[PDB]
PDB file of C-alpha atoms in Angstrom:
ATOM      1  CA  UNK Z 981      -0.388  -6.397  -6.899  1.00 18.31           C
ATOM      2  CA  UNK Z 982      -0.199  -2.492  -5.700  1.00 14.09           C
ATOM      3  CA  UNK Z 983       2.974  -0.725  -6.689  1.00 15.23           C
ATOM      4  CA  UNK Z 984       4.391  -1.464  -2.443  1.00 15.37           C
ATOM      5  CA  UNK Z 985       4.798  -5.581  -2.670  1.00 13.99           C
ATOM      6  CA  UNK Z 986       1.056  -6.289  -1.793  1.00 13.70           C
ATOM      7  CA  UNK Z 987      -0.130  -8.890  -4.123  1.00 14.15           C
ATOM      8  CA  UNK Z 988      -3.496 -11.169  -3.775  1.00 13.39           C
ATOM      9  CA  UNK Z 989      -5.737 -13.623  -5.016  1.00 12.16           C
ATOM     10  CA  UNK Z 990      -9.775 -12.741  -5.249  1.00 15.16           C
ATOM     11  CA  UNK Z 991     -11.400 -14.984  -2.865  1.00 14.63           C
ATOM     12  CA  UNK Z 992     -14.817 -13.838  -3.620  1.00 14.16           C
ATOM     13  CA  UNK Z 993     -17.162 -11.670  -5.229  1.00 15.57           C
ATOM     14  CA  UNK Z 994     -20.193  -9.658  -3.924  1.00 15.32           C
ATOM     15  CA  UNK Z 995     -22.727  -7.435  -5.486  1.00 17.01           C
ATOM     16  CA  UNK Z 996     -23.224  -3.718  -5.030  1.00 16.16           C
ATOM     17  CA  UNK Z 997     -26.056  -4.960  -2.262  1.00 13.62           C
ATOM     18  CA  UNK Z 998     -24.049  -6.374   0.207  1.00 14.47           C
ATOM     19  CA  UNK Z 999     -21.223  -4.307  -0.315  1.00 12.04           C
ATOM     20  CA  UNK Z1000     -20.594  -1.993   2.596  1.00 10.61           C
ATOM     21  CA  UNK Z1001     -21.257   2.117   1.524  1.00  9.82           C
ATOM     22  CA  UNK Z1002     -20.670   5.819   2.962  1.00 11.64           C
ATOM     23  CA  UNK Z1003     -23.403   8.167   3.746  1.00 11.32           C
ATOM     24  CA  UNK Z1004     -22.936   9.769  -0.348  1.00 12.70           C
ATOM     25  CA  UNK Z1005     -24.113   5.947  -2.002  1.00 10.96           C
ATOM     26  CA  UNK Z1006     -20.264   5.408  -2.879  1.00 10.59           C
ATOM     27  CA  UNK Z1007     -19.185   1.386  -2.851  1.00  6.53           C
ATOM     28  CA  UNK Z1008     -15.543   0.325  -2.430  1.00  7.87           C
ATOM     29  CA  UNK Z1009     -14.001  -1.256  -5.877  1.00  8.37           C
ATOM     30  CA  UNK Z1010     -12.137  -3.868  -3.607  1.00 10.85           C
ATOM     31  CA  UNK Z1011     -11.800  -4.646   0.122  1.00 14.31           C
ATOM     32  CA  UNK Z1012      -8.075  -5.752   1.771  1.00 14.61           C
ATOM     33  CA  UNK Z1013      -7.369  -6.804   4.742  1.00 14.67           C
ATOM     34  CA  UNK Z1014      -5.382  -4.368   7.297  1.00 15.00           C
ATOM     35  CA  UNK Z1015      -3.476  -7.588   9.027  1.00 14.89           C
ATOM     36  CA  UNK Z1016      -1.241  -6.541   6.203  1.00 14.78           C
ATOM     37  CA  UNK Z1017       0.047  -3.215   7.755  1.00 13.73           C
ATOM     38  CA  UNK Z1018       2.061  -3.446  10.200  1.00 12.68           C
ATOM     39  CA  UNK Z1019       4.340  -6.418   9.958  1.00  8.73           C
ATOM     40  CA  UNK Z1020       5.445  -4.780   6.433  1.00  9.97           C
ATOM     41  CA  UNK Z1021       5.677  -1.317   7.321  1.00 12.24           C
ATOM     42  CA  UNK Z1022       4.305   0.015   4.013  1.00 12.90           C
ATOM     43  CA  UNK Z1023       3.349   3.612   5.399  1.00 17.15           C
ATOM     44  CA  UNK Z1024       3.712   4.617   1.265  1.00 17.76           C
ATOM     45  CA  UNK Z1025       0.509   2.682   0.423  1.00 16.93           C
ATOM     46  CA  UNK Z1026      -1.231   4.543   3.080  1.00 15.68           C
ATOM     47  CA  UNK Z1027       0.548   8.050   2.039  1.00 15.95           C
ATOM     48  CA  UNK Z1028      -0.541   6.730  -1.501  1.00 17.52           C
ATOM     49  CA  UNK Z1029      -3.900   6.285  -0.822  1.00 16.72           C
TER      50      UNK Z1029
ATOM     51  CA  UNK M 249      52.477  -7.158  37.788  1.00 14.54           C
ATOM     52  CA  UNK M 250      48.771  -5.505  37.824  1.00 16.40           C
ATOM     53  CA  UNK M 251      49.019  -4.596  34.222  1.00 18.56           C
ATOM     54  CA  UNK M 252      49.786  -8.629  33.572  1.00 20.62           C
ATOM     55  CA  UNK M 253      46.406  -9.262  36.203  1.00 22.18           C
ATOM     56  CA  UNK M 254      44.308  -7.134  33.932  1.00 24.29           C
ATOM     57  CA  UNK M 255      45.533  -8.156  30.857  1.00 23.65           C
ATOM     58  CA  UNK M 256      44.807 -11.755  31.548  1.00 24.67           C
ATOM     59  CA  UNK M 257      41.011 -11.254  31.296  1.00 23.58           C
ATOM     60  CA  UNK M 258      38.527 -12.325  29.010  1.00 22.63           C
ATOM     61  CA  UNK M 259      36.121 -10.301  26.602  1.00 24.05           C
ATOM     62  CA  UNK M 260      33.079  -9.378  29.153  1.00 23.44           C
ATOM     63  CA  UNK M 261      30.180  -9.630  26.942  1.00 22.58           C
ATOM     64  CA  UNK M 262      27.862  -6.492  28.319  1.00 21.65           C
ATOM     65  CA  UNK M 263      24.252  -6.500  26.908  1.00 21.90           C
ATOM     66  CA  UNK M 264      21.853  -4.212  26.661  1.00 21.40           C
ATOM     67  CA  UNK M 265      19.792  -3.683  29.891  1.00 20.95           C
ATOM     68  CA  UNK M 266      15.771  -3.077  29.737  1.00 24.82           C
ATOM     69  CA  UNK M 267      13.407  -3.686  32.358  1.00 21.99           C
ATOM     70  CA  UNK M 268      10.172  -5.171  30.169  1.00 24.55           C
ATOM     71  CA  UNK M 269      10.248  -8.720  29.151  1.00 29.60           C
ATOM     72  CA  UNK M 270       9.319 -11.302  31.911  1.00 30.76           C
ATOM     73  CA  UNK M 271      12.041 -14.068  32.516  1.00 31.11           C
ATOM     74  CA  UNK M 272      10.217 -17.472  32.609  1.00 30.85           C
ATOM     75  CA  UNK M 273      13.143 -19.227  35.429  1.00 32.53           C
ATOM     76  CA  UNK M 274      13.452 -16.349  37.766  1.00 35.26           C
ATOM     77  CA  UNK M 275      10.881 -13.671  37.169  1.00 33.24           C
ATOM     78  CA  UNK M 276      13.588 -11.436  37.221  1.00 28.43           C
ATOM     79  CA  UNK M 277      13.006  -8.369  34.821  1.00 28.56           C
ATOM     80  CA  UNK M 278      16.462  -7.587  34.234  1.00 25.75           C
ATOM     81  CA  UNK M 279      16.614  -9.483  30.966  1.00 28.08           C
ATOM     82  CA  UNK M 280      18.863  -8.508  28.170  1.00 28.21           C
ATOM     83  CA  UNK M 281      17.872  -8.031  24.381  1.00 23.19           C
ATOM     84  CA  UNK M 282      18.969  -8.383  20.469  1.00 23.93           C
ATOM     85  CA  UNK M 283      16.841  -7.960  17.595  1.00 20.86           C
ATOM     86  CA  UNK M 284      17.559  -7.938  14.044  1.00 18.44           C
ATOM     87  CA  UNK M 285      16.382  -8.805  10.480  1.00 19.76           C
ATOM     88  CA  UNK M 286      17.148 -12.378  10.000  1.00 20.48           C
ATOM     89  CA  UNK M 287      14.071 -14.214   9.601  1.00 22.32           C
ATOM     90  CA  UNK M 288      13.109 -13.799   5.796  1.00 19.40           C
ATOM     91  CA  UNK M 289      11.443 -10.054   5.077  1.00 18.62           C
ATOM     92  CA  UNK M 290       8.471 -11.360   4.493  1.00 19.52           C
ATOM     93  CA  UNK M 291       7.860 -11.324   8.150  1.00 20.91           C
ATOM     94  CA  UNK M 292       8.998  -8.901  10.539  1.00 20.92           C
ATOM     95  CA  UNK M 293      12.615  -8.766  12.946  1.00 20.84           C
ATOM     96  CA  UNK M 294      13.135 -11.187  15.264  1.00 19.83           C
ATOM     97  CA  UNK M 295      14.043 -10.857  18.807  1.00 20.39           C
ATOM     98  CA  UNK M 296      15.893 -12.878  21.569  1.00 22.62           C
ATOM     99  CA  UNK M 297      15.762 -12.084  25.234  1.00 26.32           C
ATOM    100  CA  UNK M 298      18.242 -13.571  27.836  1.00 25.87           C
ATOM    101  CA  UNK M 299      17.906 -13.594  31.498  1.00 22.63           C
ATOM    102  CA  UNK M 300      21.521 -11.919  32.883  1.00 24.71           C
ATOM    103  CA  UNK M 301      19.976 -13.250  36.533  1.00 24.18           C
ATOM    104  CA  UNK M 302      19.330 -17.078  35.481  1.00 23.35           C
ATOM    105  CA  UNK M 303      20.299 -17.716  32.093  1.00 21.46           C
ATOM    106  CA  UNK M 304      16.931 -18.224  30.674  1.00 25.43           C
ATOM    107  CA  UNK M 305      16.811 -17.490  26.723  1.00 24.88           C
ATOM    108  CA  UNK M 306      13.489 -17.361  24.313  1.00 25.48           C
ATOM    109  CA  UNK M 307      12.747 -15.849  21.099  1.00 25.84           C
ATOM    110  CA  UNK M 308      10.019 -13.532  19.606  1.00 22.78           C
ATOM    111  CA  UNK M 309       8.905 -13.151  16.319  1.00 21.79           C
TER     112      UNK M 309
ATOM    113  CA  UNK O   1      -8.825   2.824 -25.821  1.00 21.36           C
ATOM    114  CA  UNK O   2     -11.889   4.661 -26.543  1.00 19.11           C
ATOM    115  CA  UNK O   3     -13.152   6.077 -23.159  1.00 16.59           C
ATOM    116  CA  UNK O   4     -15.700   3.987 -20.959  1.00 19.17           C
ATOM    117  CA  UNK O   5     -19.568   4.331 -20.905  1.00 19.12           C
ATOM    118  CA  UNK O   6     -20.050   3.782 -17.966  1.00 22.20           C
ATOM    119  CA  UNK O   7     -18.353   4.416 -14.115  1.00 24.39           C
ATOM    120  CA  UNK O   8     -17.110   1.150 -12.683  1.00 26.11           C
ATOM    121  CA  UNK O   9     -18.399   1.963  -9.044  1.00 25.89           C
ATOM    122  CA  UNK O  10     -21.899   4.616  -9.016  1.00 27.57           C
ATOM    123  CA  UNK O  11     -22.983   2.613 -12.370  1.00 27.43           C
ATOM    124  CA  UNK O  12     -23.158   6.354 -13.536  1.00 24.90           C
ATOM    125  CA  UNK O  13     -22.805   6.965 -17.454  1.00 24.09           C
ATOM    126  CA  UNK O  14     -19.680   9.237 -18.143  1.00 23.13           C
ATOM    127  CA  UNK O  15     -19.151   7.732 -22.053  1.00 21.34           C
ATOM    128  CA  UNK O  16     -21.087  11.275 -23.630  1.00 23.51           C
ATOM    129  CA  UNK O  17     -19.507  13.672 -21.815  1.00 24.30           C
ATOM    130  CA  UNK O  18     -15.684  13.723 -22.974  1.00 24.92           C
ATOM    131  CA  UNK O  19     -16.028  15.019 -26.344  1.00 28.78           C
ATOM    132  CA  UNK O  20     -17.569  18.303 -24.393  1.00 25.10           C
ATOM    133  CA  UNK O  21     -14.980  17.959 -21.131  1.00 25.81           C
ATOM    134  CA  UNK O  22     -12.397  18.224 -23.857  1.00 28.56           C
ATOM    135  CA  UNK O  23     -13.796  21.377 -25.449  1.00 27.46           C
ATOM    136  CA  UNK O  24     -13.372  23.195 -21.987  1.00 29.35           C
ATOM    137  CA  UNK O  25      -9.525  22.474 -21.595  1.00 29.11           C
ATOM    138  CA  UNK O  26      -8.670  24.696 -24.339  1.00 27.20           C
ATOM    139  CA  UNK O  27     -11.542  26.569 -25.904  1.00 23.20           C
ATOM    140  CA  UNK O  28     -12.140  28.080 -22.869  1.00 23.24           C
ATOM    141  CA  UNK O  29      -8.344  27.564 -20.796  1.00 25.43           C
ATOM    142  CA  UNK O  30     -10.037  25.898 -17.264  1.00 27.18           C
ATOM    143  CA  UNK O  31      -8.342  23.914 -14.789  1.00 26.70           C
ATOM    144  CA  UNK O  32      -9.135  20.447 -14.573  1.00 25.21           C
ATOM    145  CA  UNK O  33     -11.028  20.624 -11.535  1.00 26.12           C
ATOM    146  CA  UNK O  34     -13.807  23.123 -12.351  1.00 24.83           C
ATOM    147  CA  UNK O  35     -14.079  21.382 -15.739  1.00 24.80           C
ATOM    148  CA  UNK O  36     -15.002  17.686 -13.985  1.00 24.96           C
ATOM    149  CA  UNK O  37     -17.336  19.797 -11.680  1.00 27.73           C
ATOM    150  CA  UNK O  38     -18.814  22.012 -14.753  1.00 31.35           C
ATOM    151  CA  UNK O  39     -20.130  18.413 -16.287  1.00 34.54           C
ATOM    152  CA  UNK O  40     -21.936  17.445 -12.902  1.00 31.66           C
ATOM    153  CA  UNK O  41     -19.323  14.820 -11.684  1.00 29.53           C
ATOM    154  CA  UNK O  42     -19.390  14.762  -7.907  1.00 31.49           C
ATOM    155  CA  UNK O  43     -18.382  11.967  -6.427  1.00 33.10           C
ATOM    156  CA  UNK O  44     -14.625  11.822  -6.932  1.00 32.37           C
ATOM    157  CA  UNK O  45     -15.178   7.975  -8.694  1.00 30.55           C
ATOM    158  CA  UNK O  46     -16.697   9.749 -11.719  1.00 30.78           C
ATOM    159  CA  UNK O  47     -13.693  12.590 -11.668  1.00 30.61           C
ATOM    160  CA  UNK O  48     -11.502   9.332 -11.331  1.00 33.42           C
ATOM    161  CA  UNK O  49     -12.764   7.815 -14.292  1.00 32.06           C
ATOM    162  CA  UNK O  50     -12.628  11.253 -16.813  1.00 31.15           C
ATOM    163  CA  UNK O  51      -9.582  12.456 -15.401  1.00 33.83           C
ATOM    164  CA  UNK O  52      -6.946   9.567 -15.734  1.00 36.46           C
ATOM    165  CA  UNK O  53      -8.210   8.162 -18.855  1.00 32.29           C
ATOM    166  CA  UNK O  54      -5.517   7.227 -21.726  1.00 33.69           C
ATOM    167  CA  UNK O  55      -6.874   7.749 -25.004  1.00 34.08           C
ATOM    168  CA  UNK O  56      -4.752   5.281 -27.175  1.00 31.61           C
ATOM    169  CA  UNK O  57      -7.171   5.528 -29.901  1.00 32.93           C
ATOM    170  CA  UNK O  58      -6.016   8.081 -31.781  1.00 34.69           C
ATOM    171  CA  UNK O  59      -2.342   6.391 -32.372  1.00 37.96           C
ATOM    172  CA  UNK O  60      -3.887   2.767 -33.717  1.00 38.39           C
ATOM    173  CA  UNK O  61      -6.362   5.042 -36.016  1.00 36.02           C
ATOM    174  CA  UNK O  62      -2.890   6.332 -37.735  1.00 38.70           C
ATOM    175  CA  UNK O  63      -2.341   2.995 -39.023  1.00 38.36           C
ATOM    176  CA  UNK O  64      -3.296  -0.365 -40.454  1.00 39.60           C
ATOM    177  CA  UNK O  65      -3.542  -3.974 -39.110  1.00 38.18           C
ATOM    178  CA  UNK O  66      -1.258  -5.548 -42.034  1.00 38.21           C
ATOM    179  CA  UNK O  67       2.186  -4.878 -41.555  1.00 41.52           C
ATOM    180  CA  UNK O  68       4.129  -3.423 -38.182  1.00 42.50           C
ATOM    181  CA  UNK O  69       7.868  -4.250 -38.473  1.00 42.40           C
ATOM    182  CA  UNK O  70       9.947  -4.774 -35.193  1.00 43.11           C
TER     183      UNK O  70
END
């Protein structure tokens, strides 16, 4: 869970090769869905990020 | 007599006027609205739209 | 809890640099960003590893596994 009422479960795990990467070779430790932002209006999550 | 005739009337529930939603019965966009936080806070607000031309009612959530 | 040996994201190694990083902070009186960049930490994930570390090993060490009270 994050500090703004956004909690979930792990649904699958991927290895560093199947992870999308940036031009600098950085890889996300985790990936969440954007369908969770609008109805919850947790703009503080985005600002904290 | 005029004051009594005025005082014998009932409460007129005049609702907010808007022109965005389309009614399903007469399709006249003069449909009033009312929106509130009533559903569980796990979900966004709930709106109820009532057509002032025909009497249709519906909900969006 | 002693410093993680490796970076959780880019696989790099930051474990050995903690001792030298602590030196720059009070012997040279530098700021945190320049000290972090002085040790080749360029991706912000390595900066995340070093910058936000709570060193709890210096508290258990003044203590024994025998007789804590409540």
